[PDB]
Structure formats: C-alpha cells, structure tokens
PDB file of C-alpha atoms in Angstrom:
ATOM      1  CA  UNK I 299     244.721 -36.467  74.458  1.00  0.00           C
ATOM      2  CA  UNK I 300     244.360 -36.689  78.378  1.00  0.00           C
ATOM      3  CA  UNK I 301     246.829 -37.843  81.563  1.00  0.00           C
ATOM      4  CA  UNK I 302     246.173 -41.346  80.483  1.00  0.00           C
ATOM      5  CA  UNK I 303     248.540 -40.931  77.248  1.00  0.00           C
ATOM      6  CA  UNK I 304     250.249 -37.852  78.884  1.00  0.00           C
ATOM      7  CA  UNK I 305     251.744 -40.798  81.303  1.00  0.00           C
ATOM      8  CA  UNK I 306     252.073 -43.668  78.859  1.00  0.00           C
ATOM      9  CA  UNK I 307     254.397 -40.918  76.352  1.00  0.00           C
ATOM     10  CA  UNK I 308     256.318 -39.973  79.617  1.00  0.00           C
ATOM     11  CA  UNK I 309     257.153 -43.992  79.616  1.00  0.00           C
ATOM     12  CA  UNK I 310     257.274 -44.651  75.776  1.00  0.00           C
ATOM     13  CA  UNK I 311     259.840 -41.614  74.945  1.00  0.00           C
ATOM     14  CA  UNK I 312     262.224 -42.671  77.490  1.00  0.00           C
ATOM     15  CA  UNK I 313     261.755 -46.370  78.962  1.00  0.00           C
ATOM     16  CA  UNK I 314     260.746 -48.280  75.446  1.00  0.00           C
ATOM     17  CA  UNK I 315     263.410 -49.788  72.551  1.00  0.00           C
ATOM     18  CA  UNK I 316     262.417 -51.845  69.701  1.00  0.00           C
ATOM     19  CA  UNK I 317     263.614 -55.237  70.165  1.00  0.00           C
ATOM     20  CA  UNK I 318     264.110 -57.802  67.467  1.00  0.00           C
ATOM     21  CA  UNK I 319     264.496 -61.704  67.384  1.00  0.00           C
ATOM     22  CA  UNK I 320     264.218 -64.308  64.719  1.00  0.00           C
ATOM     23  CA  UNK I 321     260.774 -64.411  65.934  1.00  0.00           C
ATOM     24  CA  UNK I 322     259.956 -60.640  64.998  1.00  0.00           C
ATOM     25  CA  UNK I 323     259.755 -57.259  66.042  1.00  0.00           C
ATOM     26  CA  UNK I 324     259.114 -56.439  69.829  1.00  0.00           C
ATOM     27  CA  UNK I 325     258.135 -53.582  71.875  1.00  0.00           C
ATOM     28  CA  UNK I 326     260.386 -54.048  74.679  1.00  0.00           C
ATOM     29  CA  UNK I 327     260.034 -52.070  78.198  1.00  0.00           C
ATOM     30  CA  UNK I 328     263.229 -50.652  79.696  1.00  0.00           C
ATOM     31  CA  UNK I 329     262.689 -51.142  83.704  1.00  0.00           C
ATOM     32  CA  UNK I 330     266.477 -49.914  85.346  1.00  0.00           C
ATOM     33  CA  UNK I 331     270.168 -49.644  84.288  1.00  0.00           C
ATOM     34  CA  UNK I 332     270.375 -52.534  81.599  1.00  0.00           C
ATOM     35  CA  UNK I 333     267.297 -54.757  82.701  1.00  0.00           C
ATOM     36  CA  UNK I 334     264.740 -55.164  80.219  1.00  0.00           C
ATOM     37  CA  UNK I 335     261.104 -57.431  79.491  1.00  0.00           C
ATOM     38  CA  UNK I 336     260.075 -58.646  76.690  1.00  0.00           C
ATOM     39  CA  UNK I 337     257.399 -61.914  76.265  1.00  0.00           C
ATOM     40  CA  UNK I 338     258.827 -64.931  76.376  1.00  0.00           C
ATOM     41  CA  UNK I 339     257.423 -66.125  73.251  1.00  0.00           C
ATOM     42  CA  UNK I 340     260.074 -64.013  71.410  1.00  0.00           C
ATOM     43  CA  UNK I 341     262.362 -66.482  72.397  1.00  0.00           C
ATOM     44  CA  UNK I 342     265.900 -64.084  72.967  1.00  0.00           C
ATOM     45  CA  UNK I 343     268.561 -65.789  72.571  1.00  0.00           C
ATOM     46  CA  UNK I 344     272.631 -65.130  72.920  1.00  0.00           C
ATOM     47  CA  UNK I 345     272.441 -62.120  70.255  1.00  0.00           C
ATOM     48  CA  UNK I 346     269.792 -59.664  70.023  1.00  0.00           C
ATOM     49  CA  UNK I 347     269.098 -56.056  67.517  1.00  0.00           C
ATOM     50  CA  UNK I 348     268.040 -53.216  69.538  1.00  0.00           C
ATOM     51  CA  UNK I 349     267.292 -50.439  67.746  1.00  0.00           C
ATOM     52  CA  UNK I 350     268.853 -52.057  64.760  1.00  0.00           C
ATOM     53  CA  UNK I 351     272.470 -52.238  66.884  1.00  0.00           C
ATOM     54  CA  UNK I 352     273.436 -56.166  67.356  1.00  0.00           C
ATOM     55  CA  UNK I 353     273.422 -56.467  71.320  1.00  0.00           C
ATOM     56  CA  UNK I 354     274.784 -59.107  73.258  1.00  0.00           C
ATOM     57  CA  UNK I 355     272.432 -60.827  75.787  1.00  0.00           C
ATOM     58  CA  UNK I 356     273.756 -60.930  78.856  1.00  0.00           C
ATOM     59  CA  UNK I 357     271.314 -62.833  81.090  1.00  0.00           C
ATOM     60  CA  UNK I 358     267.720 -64.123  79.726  1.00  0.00           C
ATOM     61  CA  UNK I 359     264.902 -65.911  82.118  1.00  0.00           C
ATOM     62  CA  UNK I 360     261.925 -66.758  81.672  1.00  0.00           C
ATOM     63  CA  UNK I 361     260.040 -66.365  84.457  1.00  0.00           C
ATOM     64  CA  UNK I 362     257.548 -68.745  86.426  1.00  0.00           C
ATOM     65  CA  UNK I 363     255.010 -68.860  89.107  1.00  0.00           C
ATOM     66  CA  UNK I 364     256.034 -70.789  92.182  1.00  0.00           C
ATOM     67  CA  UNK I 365     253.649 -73.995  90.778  1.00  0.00           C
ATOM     68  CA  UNK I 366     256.185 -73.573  87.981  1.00  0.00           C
ATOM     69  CA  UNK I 367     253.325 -72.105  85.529  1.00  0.00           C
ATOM     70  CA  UNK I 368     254.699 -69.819  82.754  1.00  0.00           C
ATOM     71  CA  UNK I 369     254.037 -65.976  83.349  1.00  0.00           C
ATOM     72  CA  UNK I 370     255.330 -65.002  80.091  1.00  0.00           C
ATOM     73  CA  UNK I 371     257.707 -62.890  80.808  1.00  0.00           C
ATOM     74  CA  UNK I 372     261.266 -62.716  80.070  1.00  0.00           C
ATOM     75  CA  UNK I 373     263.896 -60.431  81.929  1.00  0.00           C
ATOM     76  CA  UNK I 374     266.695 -59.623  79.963  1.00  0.00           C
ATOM     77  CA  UNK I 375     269.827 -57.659  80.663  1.00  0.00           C
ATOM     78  CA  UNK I 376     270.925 -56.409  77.789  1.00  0.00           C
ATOM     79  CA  UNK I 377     275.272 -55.299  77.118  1.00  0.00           C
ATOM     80  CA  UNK I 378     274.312 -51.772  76.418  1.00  0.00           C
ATOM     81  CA  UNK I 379     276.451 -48.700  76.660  1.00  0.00           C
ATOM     82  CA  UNK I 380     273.377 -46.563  77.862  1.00  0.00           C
ATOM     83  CA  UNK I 381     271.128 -47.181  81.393  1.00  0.00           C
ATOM     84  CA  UNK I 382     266.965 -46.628  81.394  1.00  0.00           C
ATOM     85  CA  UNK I 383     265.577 -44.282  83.475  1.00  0.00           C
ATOM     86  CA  UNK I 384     264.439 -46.196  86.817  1.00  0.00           C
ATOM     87  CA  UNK I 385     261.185 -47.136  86.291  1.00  0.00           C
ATOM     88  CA  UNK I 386     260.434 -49.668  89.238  1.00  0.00           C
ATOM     89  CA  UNK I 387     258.474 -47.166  91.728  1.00  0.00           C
ATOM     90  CA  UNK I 388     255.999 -47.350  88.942  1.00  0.00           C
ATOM     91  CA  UNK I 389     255.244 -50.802  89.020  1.00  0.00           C
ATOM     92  CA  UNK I 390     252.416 -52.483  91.101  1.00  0.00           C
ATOM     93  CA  UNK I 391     253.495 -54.529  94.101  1.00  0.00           C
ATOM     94  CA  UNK I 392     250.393 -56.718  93.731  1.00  0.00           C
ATOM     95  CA  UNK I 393     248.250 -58.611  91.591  1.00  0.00           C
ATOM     96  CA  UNK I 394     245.331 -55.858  90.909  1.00  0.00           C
ATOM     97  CA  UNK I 395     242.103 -55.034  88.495  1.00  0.00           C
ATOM     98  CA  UNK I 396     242.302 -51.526  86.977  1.00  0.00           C
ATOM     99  CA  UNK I 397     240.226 -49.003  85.303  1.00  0.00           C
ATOM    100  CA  UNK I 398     240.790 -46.604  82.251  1.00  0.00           C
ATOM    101  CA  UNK I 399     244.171 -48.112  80.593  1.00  0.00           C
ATOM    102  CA  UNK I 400     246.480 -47.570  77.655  1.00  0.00           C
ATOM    103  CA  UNK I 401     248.297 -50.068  75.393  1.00  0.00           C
ATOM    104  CA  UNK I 402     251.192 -48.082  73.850  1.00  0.00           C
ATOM    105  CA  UNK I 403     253.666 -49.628  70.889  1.00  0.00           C
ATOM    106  CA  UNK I 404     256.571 -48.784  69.095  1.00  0.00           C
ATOM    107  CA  UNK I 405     257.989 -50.470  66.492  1.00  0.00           C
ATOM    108  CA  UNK I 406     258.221 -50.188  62.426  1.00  0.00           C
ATOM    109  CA  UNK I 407     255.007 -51.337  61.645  1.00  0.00           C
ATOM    110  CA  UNK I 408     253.289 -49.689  64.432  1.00  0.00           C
ATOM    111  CA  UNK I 409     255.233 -46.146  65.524  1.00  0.00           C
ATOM    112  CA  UNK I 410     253.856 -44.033  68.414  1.00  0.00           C
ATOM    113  CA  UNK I 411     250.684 -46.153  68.441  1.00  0.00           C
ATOM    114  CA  UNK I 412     248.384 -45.737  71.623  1.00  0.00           C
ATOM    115  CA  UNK I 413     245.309 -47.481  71.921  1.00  0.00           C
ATOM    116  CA  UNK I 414     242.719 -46.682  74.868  1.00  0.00           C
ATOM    117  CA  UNK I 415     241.561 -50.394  75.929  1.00  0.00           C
ATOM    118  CA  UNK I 416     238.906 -49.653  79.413  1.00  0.00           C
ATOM    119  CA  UNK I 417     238.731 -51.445  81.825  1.00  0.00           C
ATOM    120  CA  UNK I 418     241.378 -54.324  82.863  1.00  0.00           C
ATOM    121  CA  UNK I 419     240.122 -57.226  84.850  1.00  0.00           C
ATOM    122  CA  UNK I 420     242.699 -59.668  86.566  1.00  0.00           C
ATOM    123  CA  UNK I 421     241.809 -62.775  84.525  1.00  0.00           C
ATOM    124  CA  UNK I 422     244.124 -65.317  86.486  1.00  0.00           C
ATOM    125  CA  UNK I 423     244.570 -68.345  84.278  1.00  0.00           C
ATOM    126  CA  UNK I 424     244.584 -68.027  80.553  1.00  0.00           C
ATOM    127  CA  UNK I 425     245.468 -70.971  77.796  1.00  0.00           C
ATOM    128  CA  UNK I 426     247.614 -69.026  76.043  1.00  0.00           C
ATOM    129  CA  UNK I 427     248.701 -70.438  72.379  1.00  0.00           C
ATOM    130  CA  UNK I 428     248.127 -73.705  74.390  1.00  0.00           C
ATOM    131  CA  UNK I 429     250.697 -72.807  77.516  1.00  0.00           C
ATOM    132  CA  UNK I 430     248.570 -72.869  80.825  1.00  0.00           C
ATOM    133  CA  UNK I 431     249.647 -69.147  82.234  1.00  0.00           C
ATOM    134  CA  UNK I 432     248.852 -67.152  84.760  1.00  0.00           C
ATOM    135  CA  UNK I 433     248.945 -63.582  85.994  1.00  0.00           C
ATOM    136  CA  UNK I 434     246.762 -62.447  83.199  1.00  0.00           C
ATOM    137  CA  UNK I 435     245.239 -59.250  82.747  1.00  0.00           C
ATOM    138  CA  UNK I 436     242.524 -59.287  80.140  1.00  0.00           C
ATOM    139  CA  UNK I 437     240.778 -56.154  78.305  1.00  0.00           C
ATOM    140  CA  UNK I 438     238.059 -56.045  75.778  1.00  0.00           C
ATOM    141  CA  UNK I 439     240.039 -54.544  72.407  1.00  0.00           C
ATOM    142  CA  UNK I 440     240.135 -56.575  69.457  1.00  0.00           C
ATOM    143  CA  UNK I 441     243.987 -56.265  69.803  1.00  0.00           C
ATOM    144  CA  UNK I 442     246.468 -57.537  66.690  1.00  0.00           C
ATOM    145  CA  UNK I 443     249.994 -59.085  65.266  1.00  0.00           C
ATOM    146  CA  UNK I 444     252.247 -56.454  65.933  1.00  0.00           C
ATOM    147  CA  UNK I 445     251.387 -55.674  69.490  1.00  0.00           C
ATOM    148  CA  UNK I 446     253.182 -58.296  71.580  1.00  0.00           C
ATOM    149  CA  UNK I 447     255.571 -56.312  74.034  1.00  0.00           C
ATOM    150  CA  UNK I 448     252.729 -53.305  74.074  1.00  0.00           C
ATOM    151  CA  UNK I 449     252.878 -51.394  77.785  1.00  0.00           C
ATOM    152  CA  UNK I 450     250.161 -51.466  79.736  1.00  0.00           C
ATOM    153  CA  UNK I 451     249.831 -48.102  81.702  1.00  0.00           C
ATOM    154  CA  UNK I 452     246.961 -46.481  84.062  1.00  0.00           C
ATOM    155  CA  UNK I 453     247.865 -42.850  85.250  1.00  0.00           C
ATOM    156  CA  UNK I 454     250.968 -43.897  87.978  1.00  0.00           C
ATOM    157  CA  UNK I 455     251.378 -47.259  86.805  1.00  0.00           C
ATOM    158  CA  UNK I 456     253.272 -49.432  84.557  1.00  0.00           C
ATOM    159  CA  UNK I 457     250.905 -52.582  84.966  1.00  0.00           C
ATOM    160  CA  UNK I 458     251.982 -55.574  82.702  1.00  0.00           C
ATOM    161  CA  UNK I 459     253.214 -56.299  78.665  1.00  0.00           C
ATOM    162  CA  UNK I 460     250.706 -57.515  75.964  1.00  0.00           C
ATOM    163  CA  UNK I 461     251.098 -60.875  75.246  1.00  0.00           C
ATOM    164  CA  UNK I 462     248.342 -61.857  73.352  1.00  0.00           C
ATOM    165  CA  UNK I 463     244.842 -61.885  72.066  1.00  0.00           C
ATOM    166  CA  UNK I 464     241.088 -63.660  70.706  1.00  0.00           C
ATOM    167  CA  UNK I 465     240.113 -61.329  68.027  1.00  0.00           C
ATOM    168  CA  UNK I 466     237.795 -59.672  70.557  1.00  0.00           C
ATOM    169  CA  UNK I 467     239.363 -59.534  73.452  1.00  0.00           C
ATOM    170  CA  UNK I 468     243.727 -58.643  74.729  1.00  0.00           C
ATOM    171  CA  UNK I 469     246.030 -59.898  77.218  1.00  0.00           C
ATOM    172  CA  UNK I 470     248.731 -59.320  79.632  1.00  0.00           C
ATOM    173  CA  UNK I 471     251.156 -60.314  81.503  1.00  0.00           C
ATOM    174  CA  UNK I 472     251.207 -58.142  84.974  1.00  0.00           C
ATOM    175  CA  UNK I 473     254.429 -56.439  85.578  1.00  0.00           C
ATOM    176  CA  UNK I 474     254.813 -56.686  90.040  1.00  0.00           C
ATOM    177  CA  UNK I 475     257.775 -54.880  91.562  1.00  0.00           C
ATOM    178  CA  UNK I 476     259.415 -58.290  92.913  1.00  0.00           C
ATOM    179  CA  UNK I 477     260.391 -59.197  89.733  1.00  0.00           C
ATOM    180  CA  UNK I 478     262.878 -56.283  89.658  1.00  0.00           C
ATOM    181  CA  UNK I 479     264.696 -56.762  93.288  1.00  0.00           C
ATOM    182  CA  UNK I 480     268.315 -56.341  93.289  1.00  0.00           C
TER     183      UNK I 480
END
C-alpha cells in the first residue's frame, strides 16, 4: 500500500522459502548463497522440506550471546541447487529501536500476509516460553500461531525474525550483520 510493503515484497518474492520441521511450518529468510534463519525453536535437524523438496541440512547453529544466553536464532545452510539474492547490506550492524515496521509471512496457512505492527522498541531481555533471551525486539500487535519465522522490515532494513508473542503484544529476534561474516 506504501514503501513500507513496497520493501518488505521486494524481500518476500525473492529472499523467503517455506520451511518445514516436525515442529511445523516456518517462514524462513534467505540471507546469501545457501545460508538461511529460521527460530531455533523449530528445532532443524539432519533433513529438512523446503518448499515441499526434502533438503539436506548441511550446517545448523543455534546461536548465543557471549554470556551464552539464547538469541533464538538458528543459521542454517541448506544443500540447495539454487543461491538467494545477497541480502546482508540490508541488515543492521547494531542493536537499534525502529519506527513504522512490517511483519511479512508466507506459508500455507498464511500466504502473502503483511501485517503493519508501529513502532519497535529494543526490549533486551525477554522470558521467552521460559528460555531467558535476549536481543529482543518487541511491538504492540496481538501477533498469532503461524507467524514464527515472520520478517521484520522498516524501509532499508531487514531487522530481526518473529519469534513469539503475549496475546497483546510480538517479538523478535534482531537480525545484526555479524552473524553473516564469511
């Protein structure tokens, strides 16, 4: 409707796959040639459908702070035939508020779904299904099942993945360039 969801199509039509583990249904972010994220609580293991095409896992972690608190994320390099668009100059280097955001998904239940969501603070530490986390972004939709692995997007920026929610309120997990070094 405006350059908000003109930039979060740009990045769902070409960066996004739907992901799926004995745990569900994923959005799942393409980042560069066969690197992907996904949150950790779909739990990937040696075998994974993308696109409804068994895939072979090539590397999975599961990334942590350096106090070795969970950030919910989990990089994956997938053995695909194909490469995603390079994505990285779009990701923040640091740990940031934002205004005016978009949570975009893609899967079966929820196809070319875009939500508007406001303002994002950086909430820090979150409790999240019990796992002390951190790196949290937090935005006041009443976000639902089916949303985990959303993209969070400003105009420019690819900011973090959904990973959760309270009924009234979403979160994130921030996306930072130094997770993608190579």
């Amino acid at each position: 409707m405006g350059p908000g969801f003109d930039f979060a199509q740009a990045i769902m039509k070409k960066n996004t796959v739907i992901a799926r583990t004995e745990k569900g249904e994923f959005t799942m972010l393409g980042v560069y040639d066969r690197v992907a994220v996904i949150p950790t609580h779909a739990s990937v293991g040696e075998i994974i459908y993308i696109n409804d095409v068994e895939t072979r896992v090539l590397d999975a972690c599961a990334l942590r702070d350096l106090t070795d608190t969970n950030l919910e994320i989990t990089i994956v390099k997938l053995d695909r035939n194909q490469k995603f668009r390079d994505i990285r100059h779009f990701l923040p280097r640091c740990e940031d508020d934002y205004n005016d955001a978009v949570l975009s998904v893609h899967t079966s239940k929820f196809p070319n779904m875009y939500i508007p969501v406001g303002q994002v603070t950086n909430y820090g530490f979150l409790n999240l299904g019990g796992t002390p986390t951190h790196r949290i972004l937090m935005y006041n939709f009443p976000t639902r099942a089916g949303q985990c692995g959303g993209v969070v997007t400003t105009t420019g920026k690819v900011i973090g993945i959904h990973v959760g929610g309270n009924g009234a309120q979403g979160f994130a997990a921030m996306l930072l360039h130094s997770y993608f070094t190579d």
